Swiss-Prot record, chain A:
Coiled coil: none annotated. The keyword Nucleus applies. Present with 16800 molecules/cell in log phase SD medium. This is Proteasome subunit alpha type-4. It comes from Saccharomyces cerevisiae (strain ATCC 204508 / S288c) (Baker's yeast).
Curated annotation (Swiss-Prot), chain I:
Component of the 20S proteasome chaperone. Forms a heterodimer with ADD66 that binds to proteasome precursors. Involved in 20S proteasome assembly. The lineage of its organism: Eukaryota, Fungi, Dikarya, Ascomycota, Saccharomycotina. This is Proteasome chaperone 1. It is found in: Cytoplasm. Transmembrane segments: none annotated. The chain holds residues 222 to 276 of 276 of the full protein. Belongs to the PSMG1 family. The gene is PBA1. Present with 1350 molecules/cell in log phase SD medium. It comes from the Eukaryota.
UniProtKB/Swiss-Prot annotation, chain J:
It comes from the Eukaryota. It comes from Saccharomyces cerevisiae (strain ATCC 204508 / S288c). Keywords: Cytoplasm, Hydrolase, Nucleus, Protease, Proteasome, Threonine protease, Zymogen. Gene3D superfamilies: Glutamine Phosphoribosylpyrophosphate, subunit 1, domain 1. Its main location: cytoplasm. GO terms for biological process: proteasomal ubiquitin-independent protein catabolic process; proteasome-mediated ubiquitin-dependent protein catabolic process. This is Proteasome subunit beta type-2.
UniProtKB/Swiss-Prot annotation, chain K:
Present with 12000 molecules/cell in log phase SD medium. The modification N-acetylthreonine is found at T1. Keywords: Acetylation, Cytoplasm, Nucleus, Proteasome. The lineage of its organism: Eukaryota, Fungi, Dikarya, Ascomycota, Saccharomycotina. One of its GO terms (molecular function) is mRNA binding. It is found in: Cytoplasm; Nucleus. The alpha and beta forms are probably products of the same gene with different post-translational modifications. This is Probable proteasome subunit alpha type-7. The proteasome degrades poly-ubiquitinated proteins in the cytoplasm and in the nucleus. It is essential for the regulated turnover of proteins and for the removal of misfolded proteins. The proteasome is a multicatalytic proteinase complex that is characterized by its ability to cleave peptides with Arg, Phe, Tyr, Leu, and Glu adjacent to the leaving group at neutral or slightly basic pH. It has an ATP-dependent proteolytic activity. GO terms for biological process: proteasomal ubiquitin-independent protein catabolic process; proteasome-mediated ubiquitin-dependent protein catabolic process. Belongs to the peptidase T1A family.
């Protein structure tokens, strides 16, 4: 039952699809936090590496962002397909892609690749964040190799996910979500220290990658 | 492992599935002989029926592929008849495309090349037959070309096939105006090599001449045996 | 869980791709160093025999395009198909934009092709890893490497192939960011000499190229010998 | 049935299974060698036949790809025969019909290697069980000799041997090669080396030898237009080889 | 390829053809020889199979077509548009040249994965 | 034991010549509910015992009409019955458009036979797990065809397929001499059929809900009696 | 209710998913023809109480 | 419009001269190609030949010779035999090995007119055929060749002239 | 049939099963059968798809 | 693949806005042609070679659209070379005729190649003429091109059975001379090829062949520059 | 060796002895069928079958086992039902096509070859299984009577007398004696064919024959007095 996608285990779940998730758990950690009007994405990062030609957070559009965990090679291709769809939708239609639409398409591609025994499903779980065009409601979504996409207030995928998804669960209150850029950033940083690069996306296609996070690290570390 | 069931290299560097096809050529337990005359080519083949009910008329392993080309198959006939239709169609297409009759050697190359596909493709099995094309080419004269499931094809001045080909060939090596004489010559060495007397029912003969290739009938074969008895 | 490349093992790892990486570990070491004013590519010609035509037999280093080159480690047969694809892809960009293709784009396309072969049952991974050295206006001199898995990483000085760990360690201790192309050459010679399994590093076993000032010069064996003795190897 | 799993896959040791087995088939195959002289190239091999009744003229292992290029093999004949048919066809589609002239040796070898390589990653076809010693002449690169393996890896060689007596012959070619070899001298060396490798009888009938050397206008088939000169590949007849042996 | 957002329009971007400018209705004025020449080989092959069916029966065309499908579907090389070596032998084009062979004929949709999906219809 | 090695698919013959994978498909009919078919010289009748998934669920449809002159019943796999029945209906309608002839009952059963026997010769696909009882009335007259998934279509005076169908078959054989002579009496013929299916019962009794009846003849286009209309025959 | 097997059944009351066996047993005890919509909504919630 | 320019090629003594009236004269190594006709086709062909020659150089590690390039252009032009390029190209160069000056001219679909004296193409060629023949002589010196080629071009009709030596190329402009 | 812990029983077996074990356990057979069928058929691991997979 | 029709519509929108003779003699066949090529009324290139080589002993000469004749002839030459290598035999003239005519028939005559194919094979000598539509005919002597009528008159007047090698060359050359003088499209020199059964083909190119130095500095120069390879 | 473990689980696989065991297993499936024989006469052929009656419910006139491929060709098979009827229809298609094109009845030797290629084509690929039926067929044409017998391997020959099924060894032994004793008239063989079936053996006897003289080259069944006479002789 383990060696095929088209075979159900006697207990009723496809093992091969599950095995793709453990590949994600082996990947680098990714984090995402939804503020009242902003979304923050944090990621887990040798001596001779060329750091000037490397960002684990790749933007699919001016207003949409996509982090990932798992096999980097698969992600680089899944990102490309999403980028083409974003422009194709912007071409066939006039409005930009809805955040829910992009994750639905990306999940469909992952789901599509599960529909044959001659194809390896993408061992990557995406963490899509952004704002709907002309909207101020932050939206964060997560996709899995199985093709299931979900909307999360805060999620972490990859290496050390359960430990980080437990820290967020107790420190993040759905009824008391952070209401400032600093507050969510501090939570994301504090989330990553339990084991730095931080990206902040704000409405109206205002995406900025933070620099000098040491201030938050120094502030959080003291507390 | 898989090398035994599909045509892929084994650790010894040999295709077992292709080699097992050679052993299938001897399942019919029939051996043949082809020799070249000055102006004609003659091929001999046994016709072990052996059942009384079985009609000897339809038991023929010699096929008239074309007007000038005939081939003799050693092995199961279901694979032989499939090979015949292939050769029976390649010769016609060559004439259509190139405007002249199919040469004997080129036909062996085409059939041998087709066999090479089965030895390389995993989902295609080797045919399991040995084809012996005999003809009188307008350029090279009489010629014999033998094809095997491995994809090889070689021209022969005289060839024998079957379980007892070694016995037959050794006699020809020691030995080495009308087609009736070579027929008697071929039959005599088959009798001498195998040691079994032959009758019309136990023998089938095919002759390739300048004009056409034809297979002798039962009565025609009996005449040649009678001539041999005169010796 | 390793009979085919489309199966995830319970640990969520692709054994077939891992075996491809292990294959490169048995290939001749290729080392690339980026200097302040150019790049250096060197490779150990493992397949050696004095009857072999040491000249006009470039097997490790190939020219994808003006201002781009690749050092090949692993199956040389697999590389030629990718290399020709890269050459075609580089010219299409020029035919389309009238601009020399950036190195990053070329590496990205090749890695994507290699990734696809790890995602199809009937396609086995390319048992080859490249070291791309090139120059473009966006980033200037840049150095890359790519694996059979189809993922690439930028580097200042990287060694691929056999004894990569030993060669990489030497690079870390000696690599100064402000070196010149020359100094990169001595370091490239130095790293291989202490890493090769051969008794001595002779020219016939060795191959070289360099991109600097922009001219790329694949060294003929005559001058490879000259630089070798100049370095004291 | 949209797909077929690859026959050739990496082993846990990093080696390709079918490739190594294919090399073994070449190793168990009949010996063939080539020598690159200063003014020509020689390719030689010996013919093993099922029976003496076989026509030796039809056992052509050395074949012409282009008038200036020739190839010999060691291993499975059918695979080599198919490759030569495609190699000749490719030499016309890819290069001649585009550039109006026959391709150089290195390019033709690369395209043959490409054909052999695409069989190394496929779910239907095993790798070709042959290694070809492709010898040819180019106007710029001059005389050349290449050996291409089942894996699709081709290397240029001054002198090389493949098959059962590869190691014994290659070492013998090592001690009897130099940059100053003449084509006539190379033929003498090639016949010698082939004599130790051959089991049994050694003459011009069990041996076929082809040489890339000076042009042969007599083989061109027509006269005039001197810019169009003859071919360079010549397959020595059994008569010529026998005369060489006695010398 | 139809647009994912709307399954009734061609995906102008992914279908790199020079914009939506080459619209569907306008690909009607064609060279007189284009249609006949594009599928000339197919017509000859099918006509050849019909004659085999008439003479040799339905078995022979079934064997011919099954062999070709075996060769075509087991051959996947997304880095080469050249026909398979065994395809020529079956088609009996191993010693023939044609303009289709001499002249075999983008950043977005020419990737390998595009052919993988089409090959498997995934 | 040895059967496990040779029952993998419908392509492997066992050393004894048995083709197991298609034998199981025939055995799949026993999982289905019993249906009984019988005919006289002028009338043909189908009787079926429907089953419900739960007491809150409607009884599954078990009798289908391909046209006004013939119909069929189902027993075995539901998905296969869906494919075969509608495929047959696609053939009733096709003939009329191009040719305007009623597709004869005999032809209807035989065009389907070729469909089932292909699946028993090729890999990947599986033999159908559904048996059909086709009844109709055309120029020739009454017809009753039993189609087995192994591509075996038999003309029958009466038969029964499904779970515990042996009991109904025994009764029909014991009464073949009787119900054939029930000509011009559609009401009596159905009562014989309802009695025939009754012998296959173990616990459940006849009810207006579970029971379904069909009849067709010279004066009766294919009609299905279900619900309150079946009370009289019980 | 549409099963993956390709067969659909007309159900007066149906429970699927985890705990369906418990839900169905109670629906058999509690469902009736005269069940008004308002009490059906409460019934659905009552069934969810046990099996959730 | 920039369409319909005139290009002319002449053979001298160990040298060739190619001249034309945005540039219509392009070189791929040591072989020069001049294209006359639609500007869109001129731009397209250059990119195509640059694409083809660059691959030729990389694969063969050798620059394409004029004789080989002549066949490449002819084969490329014949492709699209139906709906060809509305261009008449002219190739001029010197073979690296033999050193023999080479020139050729083509029609729409690649008919090699390998004239040993001179080649012209484009509009107003009808006037330039006679003028070249009246003025042309065999074995002109590079300096004498320039006068003959320039005088034929200017009087027949700015203008640019390329004088191609073995290892030297001279680019000149005319009043 | 099936692996341990996932065995499936036919509707015929279930009828033969309750009405026989009731003989030994001693329950009112009709009432006992009426209770058991509801628990057998409504939803159970033993019935599985057999309620809708078959006509 | 193949010819593409890539700009048929665009070209339509923009638009909206020789002598050859074959003579068969006793022991072979002779093919001759002129050497004048015309781009309309202009003589584009004199001294042109019109005798193509399909194989060593099979030679071709054509008229009509030049490029079409060159394209197919070279294509057929490759097939003949490949087929001969495949079959290891001297190619037949009939072989070339079948593929040559089948290829032309495939294109419905849009490939305007009118050809005369002459050669010698193991079965003897042959001489065929091929039209663009694929129709062919075989004759002892033939003529093609604009000057065909003039050449045919000489052939008809003087031709006879079992001509000798010397007579056939003279007859073919004389026939071409008639077209040279009397037809404008034909001129310049004469190319003759002789193919014999037991001898190599003889290509007799140029078989028959019937100051303004300005002072340096005359032309003014705006500027000069040096180009680097 | 009759199992060939390892090389018997897939089709189109050669065993180390050169045998394809899947075909051999298909032969064993033939050996389990009802014995069927075919006798070649001087003026025609005769076919006989031991149709084992299963139940009275079968319609006697529509339960016929000696199929008629064409008006002048008779076919009888033993083995798997799906394959036997599948082959007959395909053979029926070939006979119609030949008549359609050449406007003459298909010769028996040509008809056998077309079937042989189809049967043999299923022994080439692993996606299909060999037909599990040995088909005895024959008829009359310009060259006279012909009797052919193709095996699952695709091999067929002309026969003076053929037999298949479980009752094969006994029928063949007696069939050999008949040929040896009378080396027949269409009338005489019908009596002899009935005798062999009874010797080979609840079963019913079905017989058919096709001769130039007594049926002007058409294939007809044995009925009425002729049948009873054959039973009385047996």
């Amino acid at each position: 039952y383990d060696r095929a996608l088209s075979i159900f285990s006697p207990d009723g779940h496809i093992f091969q699809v599950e095995y793709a998730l453990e590949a994600v758990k082996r990947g680098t950690c990714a984090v995402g936090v939804k503020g009242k009007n902003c979304v923050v994405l944090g990621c887990e990062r040798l001596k001779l590496q060329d750091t000037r030609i490397t960002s684990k957070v790749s933007k699919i559009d001016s207003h949409v962002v996509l982090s990932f965990s798992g096999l980097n090679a698969d992600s680089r291709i899944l990102i490309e397909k999403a980028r083409v769809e974003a422009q194709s939708h912007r071409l066939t239609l006039e409005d930009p892609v809805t955040v829910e639409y992009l994750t639905r398409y990306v999940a469909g591609v992952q789901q599509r690749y599960t529909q044959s025994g001659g194809v390896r499903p993408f061992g990557v779980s995406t963490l899509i964040a952004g704002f709907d065009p002309r909207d101020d409601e932050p939206k964060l979504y997560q996709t899995e190799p199985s093709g299931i996409y979900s909307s999360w207030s805060a999620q972490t995928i990859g290496r050390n996910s359960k430990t980080v998804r437990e820290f967020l669960e107790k420190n993040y209150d759905r009824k008391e979500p952070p209401a400032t850029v600093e507050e969510c950033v501090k939570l994301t940083v504090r989330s990553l220290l339990e084991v730095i690069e931080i990206t902040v996306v704000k409405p109206d296609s205002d995406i900025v990658a933070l620099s000098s996070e040491e201030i938050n690290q120094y502030v959080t570390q003291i507390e | 492992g898989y090398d035994r069931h599909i045509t892929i290299f084994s650790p010894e560097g040999r295709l077992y599935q292709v080699e097992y096809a050679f052993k299938a050529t001897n399942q019919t337990n029939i051996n043949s002989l082809a020799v070249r005359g000055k102006d004609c080519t003659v091929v001999i083949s046994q016709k072990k029926v052996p059942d009384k009910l079985l009609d000897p008329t339809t038991v023929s392993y010699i096929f008239c592929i074309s007007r000038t080309i005939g081939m003799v198959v050693n092995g199961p006939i279901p694979d032989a008849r499939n090979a015949a239709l292939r050769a029976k169609a390649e010769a016609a297409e060559f004439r259509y495309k190139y405007g002249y009759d199919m040469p004997c050697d080129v036909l062996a190359k085409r059939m041998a090349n087709l066999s090479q596909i089965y030895t390389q493709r995993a989902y295609m099995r080797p045919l399991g037959v040995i084809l012996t094309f005999v003809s009188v080419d307008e350029e090279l004269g009489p010629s014999i070309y033998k094809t095997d499931p491995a994809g090889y094809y070689v021209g022969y001045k005289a060839t024998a096939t079957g379980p007892k080909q070694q016995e037959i060939t050794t006699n020809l090596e020691n030995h080495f105006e009308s087609w009736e004489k070579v027929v008697e010559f071929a039959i005599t060495h088959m009798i001498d090599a195998l040691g079994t007397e032959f009758s019309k029912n136990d023998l089938e003969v095919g002759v390739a001449t300048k004009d056409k290739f034809f297979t002798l009938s039962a009565e025609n074969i009996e005449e040649r045996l009678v001539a041999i008895a005169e010796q | 869980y390793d009979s085919r490349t489309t199966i995830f093992s319970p640990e969520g790892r692709l054994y077939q791709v891992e075996y491809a990486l292990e294959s490169i570990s048995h290939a001749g070491t290729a080392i690339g160093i980026m200097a302040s004013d150019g790049i250096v590519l060197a490779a150990e010609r493992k397949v050696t025999s004095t009857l072999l035509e040491q000249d006009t037999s470039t097997e490790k280093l190939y020219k994808l395009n003006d201002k781009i080159a690749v050092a090949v480690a692993g199956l040389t047969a697999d590389a030629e198909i990718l290399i020709n694809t890269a050459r075609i892809h580089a010219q299409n960009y020029l035919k389309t934009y009238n601009e020399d293709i950036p190195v990053e784009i070329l590496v990205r396309r090749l890695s994507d092709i290699k990734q696809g072969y790890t995602q199809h049952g009937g396609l086995r991974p390319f048992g080859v890893s490249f070291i791309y050295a090139g120059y473009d206006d966006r980033y200037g001199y840049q150095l890359y490497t790519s694996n059979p898995s189809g993922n690439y990483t930028g580097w200042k000085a990287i060694s691929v192939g056999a004894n990569t760990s030993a060669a990489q360690t030497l690079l870390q201790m000696d690599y100064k960011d402000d070196m010149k192309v020359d100094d990169a050459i001595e370091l490239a010679l130095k790293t291989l000499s202490k890493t090769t399994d051969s008794s001595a590093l002779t020219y016939d076993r060795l191959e070289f190229a360099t991109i600097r000032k922009v001219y790329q010069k694949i060294f003929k064996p005559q001058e490879i010998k000259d630089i070798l003795v100049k370095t004291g190897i | 049935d949209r797909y077929s799993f690859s026959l050739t896959t990496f082993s846990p040791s990093g080696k390709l299974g079918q490739i190594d087995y294919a090399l073994t088939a070449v190793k168990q195959g009949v010996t063939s060698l080539g020598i690159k002289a200063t003014n020509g190239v020689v390719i030689a091999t010996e013919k093993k036949s099922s029976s003496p009744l076989a026509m030796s003229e039809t056992l052509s292992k050395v074949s012409l790809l282009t008038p200036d290029i020739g190839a010999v093999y060691s291993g499975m004949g059918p695979d080599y025969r198919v490759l030569v048919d495609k190699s000749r066809k490719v030499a016309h589609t890819s290069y001649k019909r585009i550039y109006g002239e026959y391709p150089p040796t290195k390019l033709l070898v690369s395209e043959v290697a490409k054909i052999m390589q695409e069989a190394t990653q496929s779910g239907g076809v095993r790798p070709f069980g042959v290694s070809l010693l492709i010898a040819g002449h180019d106007e710029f690169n001059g005389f050349s000799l290449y050996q291409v393996d089942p894996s699709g890896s081709y290397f240029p060689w001054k002198a090389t041997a493949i098959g059962k007596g590869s190691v014994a012959a290659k070492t013998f070619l090592e001690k009897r090669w130099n940059d100053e070899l003449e084509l006539e001298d190379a033929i003498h060396i090639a016949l010698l080396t082939l004599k130790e490798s051959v089991e049994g009888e050694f003459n011009g009938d069990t041996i076929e030898l082809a040489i890339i050397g000076d042009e042969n206008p007599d083989l061109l088939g027509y006269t005039g237009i001197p810019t169009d000169k003859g071919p360079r590949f010549r397959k020595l007849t059994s008569q010529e080889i026998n005369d060489r042996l006695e010398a | 390829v139809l647009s994912s957002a709307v399954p009734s329009l061609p995906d102008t971007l992914r279908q790199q053809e020079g914009g939506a400018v080459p619209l569907s209705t306008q690909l009607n004025d064609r060279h007189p020889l284009e249609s006949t020449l594009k599928n000339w080989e197919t017509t000859q092959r099918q006509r050849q199979m019909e004659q085999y069916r008439q003479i040799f029966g339905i078995a022979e065309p079934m064997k011919r077509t099954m062999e070709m499908e075996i060769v075509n579907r087991t051959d996947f090389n997304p880095l080469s548009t050249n026909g398979s070596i065994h395809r020529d032998i079956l088609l009996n084009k191993e010693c023939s040249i044609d303009w289709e062979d001499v002249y075999p004929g983008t950043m977005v949709g020419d990737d390998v994965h595009s052919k993988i999906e089409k090959q498997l219809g995934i | 034991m040895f059967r496990n090695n040779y029952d993998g698919d419908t392509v492997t013959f066992s050393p004894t010549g048995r083709l197991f994978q298609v034998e199981y498909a025939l055995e799949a009919i026993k999982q289905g509910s019993v249906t009984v078919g019988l005919r006289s010289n002028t009338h043909a009748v189908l009787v079926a015992l429907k089953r419900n998934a739960d007491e809150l669920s409607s009884y599954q449809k078990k009798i289908i009409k391909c046209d006004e002159h013939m119909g069929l019943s189902l027993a075995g796999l539901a998905p296969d019955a869906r494919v075969l029945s509608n495929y047959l209906r696609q053939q009733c309608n096709y003939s009329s458009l191009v040719f305007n002839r009623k597709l004869a009952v005999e032809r209807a059963g035989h065009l389907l036979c070729d469909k089932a026997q292909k699946n028993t010769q090729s890999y990947g696909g599986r033999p159908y797990g559904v048996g059909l009882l086709i009844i109709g009335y055309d120029k020739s007259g009454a017809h009753l065809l039993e189609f087995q998934p192994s591509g075996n279509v038999t003309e029958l005076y009466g038969t029964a397929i499904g779970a515990r169908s042996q009991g109904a078959k025994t009764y029909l054989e014991r009464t073949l001499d009787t119900f054939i002579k029930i000509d011009g009496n559609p009401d009596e013929l159905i009562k014989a059929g309802v009695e025939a299916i009754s012998q296959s019962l173990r616990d459940e009794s006849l009810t207006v809900d579970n029971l379904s009846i069909a009849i067709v003849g010279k004066d009766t286009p294919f009609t299905i009696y279900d619900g309150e209309a079946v009370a009289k025959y019980i | 209710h549409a099963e993956p097997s390709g067969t659909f059944y007309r159900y007066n009351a149906k429970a699927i998913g985890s705990g369906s066996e418990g839900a169905q047993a109670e629906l058999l005890n509690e469902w009736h023809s005269s069940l008004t919509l308002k009490e059906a909504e409460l019934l659905v919630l009552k069934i969810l109480k046990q099996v959730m | 419009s920039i369409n319909g320019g005139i290009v002319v090629a002449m053979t001298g003594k160990d040298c060739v001269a190619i001249a034309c009236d945005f540039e219509k004269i392009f070189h791929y190594g040591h072989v020069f190609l001049g294209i006359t006709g639609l500007a869109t086709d001129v731009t397209t062909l250059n990119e195509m030949f640059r694409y083809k020659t660059n691959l030729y150089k990389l694969k063969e590690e050798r620059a394409i010779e004029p004789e080989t390039f002549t066949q490449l252009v002819s084969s490329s032009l014949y492709e699209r035999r139906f709906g060809p390029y509305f261009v008449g190209p002219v190739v001029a160069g010197i073979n690296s090995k033999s050193g023999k000056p080479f020139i050729a001219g083509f029609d729409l679909i690649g008919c090699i007119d390998e004239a040993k004296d001179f080649i012209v193409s484009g509009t107003a060629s009808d006037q330039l055929f006679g003028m070249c023949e009246s003025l042309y002589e065999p074995n002109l010196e590079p300096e004498d060749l320039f006068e003959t080629i320039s005088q034929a071009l200017l009087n027949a009709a700015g203008a640019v002239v390329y004088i191609i030596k073995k290892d030297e190329v001279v680019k000149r402009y005319l009043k | 049939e099936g692996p341990n812990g996932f065995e499936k029983l036919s509707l015929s077996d279930m009828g033969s099963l309750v009405d026989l074990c009731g003989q030994w356990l001693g329950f009112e057979p009709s009432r006992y059968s009426e209770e058991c069928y509801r628990l057998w058929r409504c939803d159970s691991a033993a019935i599985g798809a057999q309620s809708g997979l078959y006509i | 693949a193949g010819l593409s029709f890539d700009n048929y519509q665009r070209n339509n929108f923009l638009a909206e806005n020789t002598t050859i003779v074959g003579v068969k003699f006793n022991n072979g066949v002779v093919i001759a042609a002129d050497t004048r090529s015309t781009q309309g009324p202009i003589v584009a290139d004199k001294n042109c070679a019109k005798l193509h080589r399909i194989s060593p002993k099979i030679w071709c000469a054509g008229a009509g659209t030049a490029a079409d004749t060159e394209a197919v002839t070279q294509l057929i030459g490759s097939n003949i070379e490949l087929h001969s290598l495949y079959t290891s035999r001297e190619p037949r003239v009939v072989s070339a005729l079948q593929m040559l005519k089948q290829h032309l028939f495939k294109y419905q005559g849009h490939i305007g190649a009118y050809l005369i194919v002459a050669g010698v094979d193991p079965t003897g000598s042959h001489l065929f003429s091929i039209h663009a539509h694929g129709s062919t005919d075989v004759g002892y002597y033939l003529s093609l091109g604009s000057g065909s009528l003039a050449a045919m008159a000489v052939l008809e007047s003087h031709w006879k059975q079992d001509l000798t090698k010397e007579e056939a060359i003279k007859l073919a050359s004389d026939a071409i001379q008639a077209g040279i003088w009397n037809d404008l499209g034909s001129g310049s020199n004469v190319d003759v090829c002789v193919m014999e059964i037991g001898k190599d083909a003889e290509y007799l190119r140029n078989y028959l062949t019937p100051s303004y130095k300005f002072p340096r500095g005359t032309t003014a120069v705006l500027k000069e520059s040096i180009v680097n390879i | 060796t009759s199992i060939g473990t390892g090389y018997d689980l897939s089709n189109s696989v050669f065993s180390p002895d050169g045998r394809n065991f899947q075909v051999e297993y298909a032969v064993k499936a033939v050996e389990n069928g009802t014995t069927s024989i075919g006798i070649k006469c001087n003026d025609g052929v005769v076919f006989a079958v031991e149709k084992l009656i299963t139940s009275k419910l079968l319609v006697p006139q529509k339960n016929v086992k000696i199929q008629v491929v064409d008006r002048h060709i008779g076919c009888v098979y033993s083995g798997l039902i799906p394959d036997g009827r599948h082959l007959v229809n395909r053979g029926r298609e070939e006979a119609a096509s030949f008549k359609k094109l050449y406007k003459t009845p298909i010769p028996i030797p040509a008809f056998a070859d077309r079937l042989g290629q189809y049967v043999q084509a299923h022994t080439l690929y692993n996606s299909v299984r060999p037909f599990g039926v040995s088909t005895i067929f024959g008829g009359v044409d310009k060259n006279g009577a012909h009797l052919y017998m193709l095996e699952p391997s695709g091999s067929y020959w002309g026969y003076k007398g053929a037999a298949t099924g479980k009752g094969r060894q006994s029928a063949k032994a007696e069939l050999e004696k008949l040929v040896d004793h009378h080396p027949l008239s269409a009338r005489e063989a019908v009596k002899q064919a009935a005798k062999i079936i009874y010797l080979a053996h609840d079963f019913e006897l079905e017989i058919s024959w096709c001769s130039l003289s007594e049926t002007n080259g058409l294939h007809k069944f044995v009925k009425g007095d002729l049948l009873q006479e054959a039973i009385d002789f047996a």
